[PDB]
Structures are given as C-alpha cells and as structure tokens.
Amino acid sequence: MRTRSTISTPNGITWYYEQEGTGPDIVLVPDGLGECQMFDSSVSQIAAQGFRVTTFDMPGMSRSAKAPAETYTEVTAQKLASYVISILDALDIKHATVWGCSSGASTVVALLLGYPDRIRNAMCHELPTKLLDHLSNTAVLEDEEISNILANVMLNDVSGGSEAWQALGVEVHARLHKNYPVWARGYPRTIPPSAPVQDVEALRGKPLDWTVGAATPTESFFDNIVTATKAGVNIGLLPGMHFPYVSHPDVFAKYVVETTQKHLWNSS
Amino acid sequence: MRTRSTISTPNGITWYYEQEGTGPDIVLVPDGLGECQMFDSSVSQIAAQGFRVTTFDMPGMSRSAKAPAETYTEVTAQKLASYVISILDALDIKHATVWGCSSGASTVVALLLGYPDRIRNAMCHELPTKLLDHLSNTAVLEDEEISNILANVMLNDVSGGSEAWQALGVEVHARLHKNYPVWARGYPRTIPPSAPVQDVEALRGKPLDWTVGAATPTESFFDNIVTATKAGVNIGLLPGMHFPYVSHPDVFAKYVVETTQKHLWNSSSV
Numbered sequence: 001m002r003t004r005s006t007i008s009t010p011n012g013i014t015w016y017y018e019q020e021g022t023g024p025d026i027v028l029v030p031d032g033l034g035e036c037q038m039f040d041s042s043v044s045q046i047a048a049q050g051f052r053v054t055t056f057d058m059p060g061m062s063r064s065a066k067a068p069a070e071t072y073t074e075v076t077a078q079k080l081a082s083y084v085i086s087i088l089d090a091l092d093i094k095h096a097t098v099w100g101c102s103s104g105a106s107t108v109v110a111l112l113l114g115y116p117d118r119i120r121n122a123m124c125h126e127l128p129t130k131l132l133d134h135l136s137n138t139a140v141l142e143d144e145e146i147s148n149i150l151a152n153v154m155l156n157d158v159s160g161g162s163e164a165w166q167a168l169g170v171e172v173h174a175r176l177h178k179n180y181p182v183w184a185r186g187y188p189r190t191i192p193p194s195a196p197v198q199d200v201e202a203l204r205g206k207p208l209d210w211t212v213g214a215a216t217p218t219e220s221f222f223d224n225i226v227t228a229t230k231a232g233v234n235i236g237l238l239p240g241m242h243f244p245y246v247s248h249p250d251v252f253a254k255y256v257v258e259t260t261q262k263h264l265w266n267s268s
Numbered sequence: 269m270r271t272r273s274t275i276s277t278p279n280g281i282t283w284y285y286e287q288e289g290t291g292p293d294i295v296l297v298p299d300g301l302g303e304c305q306m307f308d309s310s311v312s313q314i315a316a317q318g319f320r321v322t323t324f325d326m327p328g329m330s331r332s333a334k335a336p337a338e339t340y341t342e343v344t345a346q347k348l349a350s351y352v353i354s355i356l357d358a359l360d361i362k363h364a365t366v367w368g369c370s371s372g373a374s375t376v377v378a379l380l381l382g383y384p385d386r387i388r389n390a391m392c393h394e395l396p397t398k399l400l401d402h403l404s405n406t407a408v409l410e411d412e413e414i415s416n417i418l419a420n421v422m423l424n425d426v427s428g429g430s431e432a433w434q435a436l437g438v439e440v441h442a443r444l445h446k447n448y449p450v451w452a453r454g455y456p457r458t459i460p461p462s463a464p465v466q467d468v469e470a471l472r473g474k475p476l477d478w479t480v481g482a483a484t485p486t487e488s489f490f491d492n493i494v495t496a497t498k499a500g501v502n503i504g505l506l507p508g509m510h511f512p513y514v515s516h517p518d519v520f521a522k523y524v525v526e527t528t529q530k531h532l533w534n535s536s537s538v
Contacts, residue, residue, distance in 0.1 A: 217483050217486070237487055
C-alpha cells in the first residue's frame with residue numbers, strides 16, 4: 001500500500017522517498033538528521049483521512065546520501081527549501097501542506113515565504129535561531145567520537161522519551177550513526193543564522209502554525225514563542241520534546257490532520 | 269551590619285523582617301513558602317551597590333507565623349499586596365522596587381497596578397495563572413504526608429539544583445516542613461485565579477520586568493511569555509528554575525541590581 005522508491009533531480013540528488021494515500025498533499029520534512037523512518041507510524045494514520053502523505057530522507061543522509069557535497073555542507077534554510085521544491089517538482093506536487101522540525105522547521109518557513117503559491121500552510125516545530133557553541137565544537141572531532149556523543153544526546157537529552165527512541169530499531173540507529181558526523185559538520189553552525197524569522201512583519205497573516213515541545217527546557221525555544229506572538233502566528237505546545245512524531249506519534253498525527261483540515265476549510 | 273527583627277502591623281501580623289544597606293529601596297518578596305532566608309546570600313551583594321534591601325517572612329509562614337487565619341487561608345494576590353503595603357508603611361518605605369516569585373510574582377504585579385505611586389518597578393518571576401490539580405489535592409491530606417510529598421517536589425521538580433537547595437540547612441528545612449501544609453491549604457487553589465495579568469492592556473507601558481526559569485519545562489510558564497509579549501513587557505530568562513535566588517544567587521543579585529539601575533535612570537523629569 002505504501003510506495004517506497006527513489007527519484008533523481010537536476011541538482012544532483014538521488015532522493016529516497018515514501019508516499020501513501022490520495023487527496024490533498026501533506027509533506028513531512030524531517031529534521032537535520034534526515035530520517036523519514038521516524039514518520040513511519042503516523043504516515044499511514046494521516047493518509048487514511050483522505051490525504052496523500054509524502055516524506056523522504058534529506059540530502060546526504062541515510063538513504064538520500066547520493067548527492068553533491070554542496071547539499072550537506074554549509075547548509076541553510078534557503079538551500080534546503082530549494083531542494084524540497086525540486087523533489088516536489090519531480091513528484092508533481094503543485095500545492096502542499098508542509099511539516100518541519102529542527103532544520104526542517106527553518107525549511108518550511110523558508111518554503112512558505114519563498115514559494116507562497118506552492119505552500120497551502122506550514123507547520124514548524126522548534127525552529128533553531130541561536131548558535132549553540134557546544135554543538136559547533138563537535139564538528140572538528142573524529143567521526144566515531146561525534147556519533148557516540150550525539151547518539152547519547154538524542155537519547156537522554158532531547159528525544160522526549162528514550163523508550164520510543166530506542167524502539168526505532170538497530171537499522172535506523174545504524175543509519176543515524178553515519179548521519180551524526182555529516183550533520184555536525186554541515187548544520188549547527190550555518191542553520192541558526194539562516195532562520196527566516198528575523199523579519200517579523202513577513203510572517204504576519206501567513207498560514208503558519210508554530211509548536212514547541214512541552215517537556216523541552218524554556219531557554220531552548222523561548223525565542224520562538226516571542227517571535228510567534230509578535231507576528232500573531234498560532235503558537236502551541238506538543239507533548240514531548242524535539243521529536244513529537246517519535247515520542248507521541250498519535251498526538252502528532254492528529255495535530256497534522258486537524259491543522260490541515262482547518263486550512264482546507266479556510267480556502268473559500 | 270544587617271538588621272534582623274520583628275514588627276507588628278494594624279492587620280494583626282507580627283512580621284519577621286531583615287534589612288541592610290542605604291539608598292533606594294529594594295524589597296524581596298518571597299514565594300508561597302514564605303522564607304526570606306533563601307535571599308540571605310544576595311541581600312548583602314545587592315545592598316553593597318548603594319541600595320537598602322528589605323525582606324521578610326510572609327504571614328503564617330516561618331517566623332511571621334503569628335497572624336490571623338485570614339492572612340494564610342484563601343490567599344490571593346490582592347490580599348498579599350495589602351499585607352506588603354502594611355509592612356512598607358510600618359518601616360516607612362514610601363517608594364520601592366519589588367521582586368516577587370510564585371505567589372510573590374502575582375503580589376508584585378498587584379502592587380504595581382494597585383499602588384503605582386509606591387512601586388518604582390516590579391520584577392515578577394514565574395507567575396502562576398493555571399490551576400494545577402496535583403497541588404490542590406494535597407490540601408485534604410494529613411500534615412506529615414503533605415510535608416513529605418512537597419519537600420520532595422521542591423527538591424527534584426522545582427528547585428533548579430538540589431545541591432544548593434539542600435545546602436540551605438536543617439533550620440530552614442525545619443521551618444519549610446511546617447509551612448508546606450499551611451501553604452497547601454491556603455495558596456494553590458485560590459492564587460492562580462487571582463492573577464492580575466487577565467487584563468493585558470493594564471500592563472502596557474508599566475515598569476515591569478518579567479522572567480522565567482531557563483531549565484523549567486516550557487509548558488509550566490508558557491502563558492507568561494505569551495502574556496508578556498502581548499503587553500510589550502520585558503520578558504527574559506534567569507538560570508535554573510523556580511528559585512533563582514537559591515540556585516544561582518550571583519546571577520540573581522546581578523539581575524536585581526541591573527534592572528533597578530535601569531529604572532532609576534528612566535526617572536528623568538522635566
């Protein structure tokens with residue numbers, strides 16, 4: 001029932017993607033780690049409510065690794081947005097709703113502002129705007145030391161539930177193990193400055209629904225709550241921390257459906 | 269060089285209070301637990317920058333226990349504000365800056381809106397606006413079960429650093445042990461509805477500086493960040509969670525001084 005296949009784009013990226021259902025399009029953009037297997041559970045639930053749910057591994061990560069070095073080094077929100085537009089052009093998704101978290105959250109807002117004709121609405125979760133120095137300093141280390149440090153960080157520190165995180169399996173953690181060094185060198189230094197939330201007036205009136213993890217420390221995404229409230233954007237909380245889709249997949253899947261149905265109603 | 273003494277007010281409360289330094293007045297209002305010994309470290313540091321730092325145990329708690337039942341049962345922000353005004357009238361503090369956290373945060377905002385002539389500026393930290401059911405259900409239990417449950421809650425859940433919290437000592441935790449049942453019955457059910465942050469336009473333009481704990485979960489005081497940003501009030505972070513003055517006393521003491529110095533500068537009259 002679910003499609004699992006590859007597709008190549010003019011920019012040089014051979015994407016691994018998954019697709020299920022028919023109806024209005026919902027695109028699940030992953031985090032910096034770039035693993036679409038985290039969405040697996042919720043993809044079938046969301047697609048069963050009359051939607052075509054698309055998702056894919058991000059360039060250079062896991063199954064979408066066959067790409068140029070440009071696509072996973074010195075990565076920005078605007079670069080990732082252009083790469084997402086390319087796969088949507090390849091699969092012929094002309095109008096879509098977009099979910100995004102971490103670097104994916106920066107990407108979906110860049111998609112909405114940059115390509116308003118193509119985005120119905122966007123759902124950003126925990127968009128990073130600050131340069132964390134302890135994440136930048138890992139880039140210079142050896143590959144196995146980065147993977148051991150960052151795998152422990154995701155487990156204990158930001159998963160929002162270790163048990164759920166573990167339950168992804170050995171094959172997923174094996175793919176994440178290879179991604180941590182690629183992410184560390186490309187993402188954390190260059191992503192937070194490229195956040196498109198500097199201009200507050202650009203965000204006002206846009207079909208945007210912002211969320212933050214309920215169990216996350218307040219300092220981590222305090223700026224999202226301030227920026228969203230100034231722009232008049234809907235800001236809310238989701239259970240867990242950084243990966244609602246992994247920790248609370250049913251509550252995540254319900255939020256994606258209810259938000260998309262609300263914006264489909266407003267189109268008149 | 270620090271005064272430690274007691275004083276009585278017309279409303280029936282015999283206050284335990286502490287005072288140090290000379291200069292513009294800064295009043296450190298405690299939390300619902302009502303213990304001013306938590307401020308001990310920072311009081312000397314804040315007073316040394318040219319300020320008269322005042323603080324006191326709240327009615328019915330710790331050393332200010334001698335009071336009527338009205339003052340520690342069905343407690344609201346507006347009641348606590350009137351009790352704070354009474355001790356400031358007793359000590360002859362006509363103009364002051366006020367710090368407040370928890371129920372104290374609700375009190376200082378009630379002080380600012382209710383008595384604008386008396387308050388230079390207010391500093392609220394983690395003002396509760398929601399009714400937490402797990403805190404309300406402790407009120408009905410026996411006194412020893414409340415104290416054992418709530419002392420564990422403060423240590424692990426909201427202290428923001430166990431080592432610092434524990435280091436307050438046996439005498440302070442002995443006074444907190446007696447306060448937990450008095451707090452449980454009086455505060456958590458009646459305090460959050462009495463928050464004066466319901467009217468957003470009342471807060472606009474006021475000399476108010478709001479803070480939230482950095483390590484605190486986002487859901488706990490998400491409403492504070494939303495309400496403050498709508499009102500155009502300065503909203504920021506302090507390290508730790510609920511008790512910055514206990515966990516990070518140097519960073520707390522610096523924030524109280526820098527904020528008070530900023531509002532003293534703004535008093536520039538033609």
